[PDB]
Amino acid sequence: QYPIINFTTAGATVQSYTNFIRAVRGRLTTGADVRHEIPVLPNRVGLPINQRFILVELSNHAELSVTLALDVTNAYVVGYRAGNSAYFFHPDNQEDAEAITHLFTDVQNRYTFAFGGNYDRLEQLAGNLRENIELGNGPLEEAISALYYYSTGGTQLPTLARSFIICIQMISEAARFQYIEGEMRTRIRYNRRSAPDPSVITLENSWGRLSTAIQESNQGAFASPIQLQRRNGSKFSVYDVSILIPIIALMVYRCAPPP
């Protein structure tokens, strides 16, 4: 009963990717929570299990499909299904462990990885940092194949980890940040793969802090500035929500909105 959004790398265009990310955002957020023009994801607290997840079905030119499961509270990729097998990252707590039992319930083989799904752990396993992992339609095409072939032993663990890193940034991070979506649109428009620059990396790393700063702000004004980086690595100071309206598409729930 969880909603499914389809995307294929096969003949992907700027428009088809834009449609996809728009659809993902639409299934992640209700209209219930919008602050300083920026939507907030559902609060985890009291969220019914039947509303907890969305499914992203990825297809490629190789005629292979995988289904990613995303947690609506944070857009986090919690696991995936390929054919007869499902794989889940090590859950943070008992609540999350119970929650994932509601996913891919008719799958023949269920596995939980002994490792968590955060970038730190995935980069360790991949043997490469995000700054050195190329993104684009080509990488995503290849990532879908790598995820598909894992269960049969065709995909090594570093390649699997790399492939998760690709999927997470091109789907979850693009959903969170219009800026990151824009960066992916550009890669697709010119069919040119490239690793994410410091502006992308620092946004990814700052999503929680940015969400909290916006939600705890005084009429939009931050108590403490947040430092980001430009494409060339130079520092950019954020003092206010206003500058982030074109940049951030969705926030994680951090506090209640003030009256």
From Swiss-Prot:
A carbohydrate binds at I4, I5, N6, G11, G46, N137, G138, P139, L140, E141, E142, N191, R192, R193. Changing V72 to A/M: No effect on the toxic activity or the vascular leak syndrome. A deglycosylated form may be linked to monoclonal antibodies to produce immunotoxins exploited in cancer treatment. However, a point mutation should be introduced to eliminate vascular leak syndrome, a side effect resulting from endothelial damage. AMP binds at Y76, V77, G117, N118, Y119. Coiled coil: none annotated. It catalyses: Endohydrolysis of the N-glycosidic bond at one specific adenosine on the 28S rRNA. It comes from the Eukaryota. The active site is at Y76, Y119, E173, R176. Glycans are attached at N6, N232. Acts as a glycosidase that removes a specific adenine residue from an exposed loop of the 28S rRNA (A4324 in mammals), leading to rRNA breakage. As this loop is involved in elongation factor binding, modified ribosomes are catalytically inactive and unable to support protein synthesis. Can inactivate a few thousand ribosomes per minute, faster than the cell can make new ones. Therefore a single molecule can kill an animal cell. This is Ricin A chain. The chain holds residues 40 to 298 of 576 of the full protein.
